[PDB]
Paper text:
Ribose-phosphate diphosphokinases or PRPP synthetases (EC 2.7.6.1, also called ribose-phosphate pyrophosphokinases) are a family of enzymes that catalyze the synthesis of PRPP from ATP and ribose-5-phosphate (R5P), yielding AMP as an additional product. The E. coli ribose-phosphate pyrophosphokinase (EcKPRS) is a class I PRPP synthetase with well-defined kinetics. As observed in other members of this protein family, EcKPRS has two α/β/α-sandwich domains related by two-fold pseudo-symmetry. The propeller-shaped homohexameric structure of KPRS is composed of a trimer of dimers, with the C-terminal domains forming the dimeric blades of the propeller and the N-terminal domains forming the hexameric core.
Residue numbers in the entry:
A (entry chain B), D (entry chain B): 3 to 195, 204 to 313
B (entry chain C), C (entry chain C): 3 to 313
E (entry chain A), F (entry chain A): 2 to 195, 204 to 314
Amino acid sequence: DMKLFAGNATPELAQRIANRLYTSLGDAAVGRFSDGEVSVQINENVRGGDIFIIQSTCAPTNDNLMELVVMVDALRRASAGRITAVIPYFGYARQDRRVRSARVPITAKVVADFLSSVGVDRVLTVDLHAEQIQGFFDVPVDNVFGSPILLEDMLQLNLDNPIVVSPDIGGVVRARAIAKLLNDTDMAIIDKRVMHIIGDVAGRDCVLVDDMIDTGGTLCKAAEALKERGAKRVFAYATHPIFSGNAANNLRNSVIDEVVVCDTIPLSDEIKSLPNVRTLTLSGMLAEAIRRISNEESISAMF
Amino acid sequence: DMKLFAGNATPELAQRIANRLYTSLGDAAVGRFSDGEVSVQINENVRGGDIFIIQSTCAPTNDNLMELVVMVDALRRASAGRITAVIPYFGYARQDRRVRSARVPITAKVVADFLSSVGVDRVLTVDLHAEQIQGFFDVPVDNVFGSPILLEDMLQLNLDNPIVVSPDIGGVVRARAIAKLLNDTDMAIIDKRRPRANVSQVMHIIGDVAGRDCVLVDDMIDTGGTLCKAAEALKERGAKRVFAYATHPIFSGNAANNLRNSVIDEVVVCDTIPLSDEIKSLPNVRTLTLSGMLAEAIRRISNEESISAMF
Amino acid sequence: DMKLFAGNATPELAQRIANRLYTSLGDAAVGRFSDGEVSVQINENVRGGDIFIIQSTCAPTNDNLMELVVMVDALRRASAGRITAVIPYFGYARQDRRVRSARVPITAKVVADFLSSVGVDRVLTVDLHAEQIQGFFDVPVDNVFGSPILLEDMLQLNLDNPIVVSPDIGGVVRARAIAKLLNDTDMAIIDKRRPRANVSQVMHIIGDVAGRDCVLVDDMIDTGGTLCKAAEALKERGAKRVFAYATHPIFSGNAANNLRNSVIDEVVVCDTIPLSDEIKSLPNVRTLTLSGMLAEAIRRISNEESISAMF
Amino acid sequence: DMKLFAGNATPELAQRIANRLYTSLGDAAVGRFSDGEVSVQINENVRGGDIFIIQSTCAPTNDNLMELVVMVDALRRASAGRITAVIPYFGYARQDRRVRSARVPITAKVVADFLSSVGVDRVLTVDLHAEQIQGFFDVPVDNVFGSPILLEDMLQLNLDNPIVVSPDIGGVVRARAIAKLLNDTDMAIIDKRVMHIIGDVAGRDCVLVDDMIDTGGTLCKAAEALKERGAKRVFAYATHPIFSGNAANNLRNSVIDEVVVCDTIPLSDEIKSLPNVRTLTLSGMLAEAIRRISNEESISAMF
Amino acid sequence: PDMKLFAGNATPELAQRIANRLYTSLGDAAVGRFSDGEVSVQINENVRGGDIFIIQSTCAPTNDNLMELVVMVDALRRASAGRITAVIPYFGYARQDRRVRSARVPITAKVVADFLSSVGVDRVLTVDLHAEQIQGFFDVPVDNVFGSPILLEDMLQLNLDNPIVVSPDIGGVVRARAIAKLLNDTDMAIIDKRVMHIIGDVAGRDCVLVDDMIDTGGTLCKAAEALKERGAKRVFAYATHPIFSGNAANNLRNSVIDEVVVCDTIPLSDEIKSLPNVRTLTLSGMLAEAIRRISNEESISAMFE
Amino acid sequence: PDMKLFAGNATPELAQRIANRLYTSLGDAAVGRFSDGEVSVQINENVRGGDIFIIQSTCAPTNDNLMELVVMVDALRRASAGRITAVIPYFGYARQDRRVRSARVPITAKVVADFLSSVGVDRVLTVDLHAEQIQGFFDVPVDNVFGSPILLEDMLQLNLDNPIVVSPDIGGVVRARAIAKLLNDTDMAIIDKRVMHIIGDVAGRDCVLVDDMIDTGGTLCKAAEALKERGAKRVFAYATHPIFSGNAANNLRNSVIDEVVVCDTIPLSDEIKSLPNVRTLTLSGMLAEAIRRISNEESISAMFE
Ligand SMILES: [Cl-]
Ligand SMILES: [Cl-]
Ligand SMILES: [Cl-]
Ligand SMILES: [Cl-]
């Protein structure tokens, strides 16, 4: 039967998922030795079990990654029946290619190899930076989108003739998809050369959208440029709240009226102390995905 | 010793490359048995050689792919020193994911595995449909761009205040890159919408194209339907002349007729895929060779020189 | 739950098999994109199912093979419980070695690796050109023989003191096996020689065939040239009637004309490969179904019953 | 540069090969611990070297196999540049399929996997029982034929109108190939039901040929049946002298005028004491193959 | 229910004892030799979808017994076995587990692990591996069961006089210490070559020599002599694996060892079976319980006590 | 000639010392972090066809330093490096090398070996592996160099008074015995928890505590106290790997240890660097020579003496 475990990356999210599945997070001791080496022991019988591990590979990335892979190795050596890595936010996803044959690692592929090597049978994740990461594995990878929940929220805002806009050139595809869903509305595009805005945003509510928010620098400069060109209100929507570096002060001194993110990464206390940062939960979506996977039901029929 | 072999996919491109490397193509019998099974025999000693196979996996895709993987296997079992697959056009590249967990293959990855399995040590290709395909392999994958050569030709046209245009949302990154290099001009974008069955597909133009030559640029042209509708929409919004540039001339289905009946002043493509007879009969379709780029890339690989320097 | 899917290689055989298993073929869209790339989508839930794909890798070989491996990949990524490739005719089986270290591929092994790589859990096939192909895989490979069905039909002819004949040296083991089962009759062998350019190929007959019906038996017929010359030689040595039996009707090249112009009284083949229109027009070519054998083999695999019992 | 080593299977053959290559067998201690476990130590620097190991997997098969695989593992872990297994007689070659889905191992494939696993880069062997064994490896496999040397011998016999004959049904292909080479002469075929002889052998010299001779039982019964049907002289030719079981007494009480075999397996003293058993050496052929492999010269051009 | 047991010729008696404790007949695998000495294996029963356990130590003759095991696995895998567990009470080649000073030798324990993984072993069950780290030479689960509880139970029934537990060499000190703790927290002695020097008060006491295995018996016999030279009362030698190679029979027969007590992971030769001072314990209870737990997906942790 | 050295942030000073002894500049790998803490690696020089050595212990912070190493290897492999040798003086996670009593834990040493093999390491060079058998966790060559000759040379220059070599616990007895033999065939003492009990005559003698590594220092400090309680003269503690986690600085600062002598496979914190009773030896000579030999295809066996 089904068993859930969680590491130390997203335990609050993990509990929410467990509650919606009417079950609990099983007993695994996930900690550290004195020297900082990860320590894992599975304190339950998992023989022949259908195991799900809930763990984003978010900050601290390499520790949380190592927690996940050694949990998998422990479970596999303990004769787990099936092991699914539920990785709401998949870290290193941005390292997915070698532009101009630059001598960089393709770290997303490396992580996929690592997970495959320790015996992951399946991956469940939310809004991969690049969908092609599905092809970095042999095993099934289910990449569920956060947009159904983000959209539902955008709809409850009563936007005066909203235009959707991608903060940079690499997010245009995602912005367009959101524009389609938001009553087939217009899209603008920001092109840095100074930030040139391609599209008519004067007198309109603007929905800035991306897959993730990191330092918030580009997002903040974009929101400024939008209002410098006559935008009314500016909302920032993303799935993954990375919020590294000086993100909290960037958003606090920004022009953005509200920031809406999902809960694939926990928020720091500084970010929780901001009045205009709101959280939406994917616990319902992930719980349902988990249920369907456990019960051999179609996942296709949930997008 | 460097040795070049070609299959039947791109033999004229292969020949050009060999010419530019001041060499000749090696003796390999690449054909068919009576029943359509691929027949390969390498008719020279390749032991310890630095071998490059020049084969796009273009139409007919499955025969050309099989010729490739089978050539690799024969070379490997005959103790080739190193095997580089030069695949100017990498077929199946569009099958690179499972959107909404649709029960579809990721064939681009399957092809990568197949090449890896028979012992390809390196891949050289031009303008992969998705760069992430580099990550579908363990081995080095160099993904060169045709855009420098396309650009060289764009400059030779002397355009009236040209604007670069991406025919769809996926080509935007490339369009900008070219806008920058094309005398730091500006860019426009095609936003295709068709939300309802009773409403016609509209091709929205994000940007101002009125009274300006338009350079439509993309990685490939397949049936040309999007491209022709993009062209039409540009003219209706007041664009002067419309030029279409792309690397891969796939031109399947009704492409020749679509172009013939289009408002496109000229279509300029690279030679990663040989042109059909239907396409060769069009007056306004012109071809640029990447045999220069690929010869140098190959030269650098064999001499252990930096490939980064090529971008 | 057991589920059967078919590609476009052997859809009528697939249908027969489904009928005999009292089921229907699953919903899978197996086609092409405009450019000739294989397009597959599995249009039902296969999660945890016991899946069998029915596809010979017959002509066009490379398209049919690619359909197969791509179907497997889509099923695997969609969490099929188990995937069995039912490949009645296994193409590329003749490319199974490198004679004299000739610089050729061992494509039969390459195909095996490809199937393994995409996650085939088992292979079911009929009369592999070489049984050793079983060893080209890790997974279980069941190699069933068509000869029981061919034999059933041979017995229905009532022959005048029949002698079983292997059309070449490779079919001798099978010919004997059949000689034994065909009322423990005797056997003869065709020893083809052509040592010199100025001498005609002679087809030596080892054994006495005078005043006897001859049953030419083989695993396959391709162009039929050997078979027709074998037939002619038998008659010239005094054989009465000549019947030709084989499992795989490949019939490439000029096979139809070769048979039409032959002295062969009747040619009887199994349905592992669909017949060409050219062949269907011949009065003396007849077809036997293995859909009974393959349905039972599949039934046994899914119920975990002994396959050994099937020989 | 090139280095040769040998195990304890075919050291005399190995020395002959080494002599013809104007080199020597390098220092490897190949022996046993007290309990019978194989003991290997390579007593030379092999770093970056082009290594050839000479070792048939003949009786005792599993010991000689283990000697070979652990020699390879020792050499690989010691950073050998390239490792070629020269395996004149490839044992377990007869276990190459599962007839009627019999629940037997395909041991030939298993051995190939084992050799591949320890890091063999290439295999050189003589007259594989089944040529398809080339396809059991990823790596190059060169299967040289003994027939050029066997034929050269047959030619020096002045055979009165020789007929070539395969002792059983499974050797017909090989007999025919020999018949072609022996001035395109006739072939007969033995069919056990009593042994039926298909072909006219009355008043003719008979050349019984196979890839190997094991107990000699079938070979002896065949030679008898040939003379019972009026054959003049009967010669037995094979590449691999296995000579297991009661082979020596079988041949001694047989009708065979002479037995001619190659040196891919050493002869027992009982077999050496027979007046009508002669040996031909493949040391020249194997040395030449080794030389060509070492020098990146065509092997194709030696068949 | 879907469980089936098979066995090769390495440990037939042990295999039968295990089978008896699981109330299960041994499967029909015709494991023999062709005339030339090549292994012959045929499985004469349906194993499709089964949970299959093969009982075969890789003891002398090592290479033959290893090959039986691996070809048995291959035949079973190609015959569509559901799961395959290699039960290898004594794991041969375990001592070849490293390259000391980068000596040009094989890591044959790893080579064997690779071989077993390659032919499709899904898990390994084994007793007192020479090195525990051999668990890491596999990807698959490896259960390394200890003989110590059985050996300890026997020790406790001897009614020894103030026993001292002692290692035959410096290499066995860790185990000896552990068995000393378990044996009513008694004392430990240590044997160190310097002649053999005994570190500890052995005078007047029953001594218990302990090790994972006994090979030729040479060191063990000297150890026993030295102990009695220092006034030891009785000397017992407890070990798991009775390798007994070379001159072991004479060594034990001429020793001052009161009793050698070994487990049944390697069959005894007739000669050593005759020795009055050599006694065997069976692990068939332990191994049968482990198999039953693996079969029914119960905890293996509970096997250690 | 085709040799190039790179290094991450784990052991920069050691890497530089190795580089200096090979008269070779360290290659330009920009090894850093993005804003979020993800490893950032770019190789800013041609490495095509090169013989590449990466110098990176997987010491604290372990997971960051391991990830630097593996992504460095991947970047180099995809950039067409000819050969890649991971030089990992201290190999982290080496203690997680087994599953005792089938405990549901990872064999993380093996997981790391797999990871390194997967990204394309062609060989590993390392110093005093916690378990030698970790050599068998790889398919590729693994050279496990010993610190002992450097540590022994230092010991011999102290001009000790009738030194006795001693293990801090039962687990280090084998090494202690080996170093006793090398140290002019001197005596050995053993420390056994029973309070700590010293087995041996330490009275009036300089004692040399020896181990492969020092972590918190707790056991080492008690060991030193017990030795002096039994009349030891001076107590030195020699080890290879200075892990020094937890409260190591206070433990050493408050010890009765005259000198702690460690090798430079893990950099020292500023606090421990300040301690007057803590001294480092360098292995850069040894590792540089090993690399030079690997590079020129010379015997490594000669490195052990
Ligand atoms: Cl480069
Ligand atoms: Cl069966
Ligand atoms: Cl457990
Ligand atoms: Cl060396």
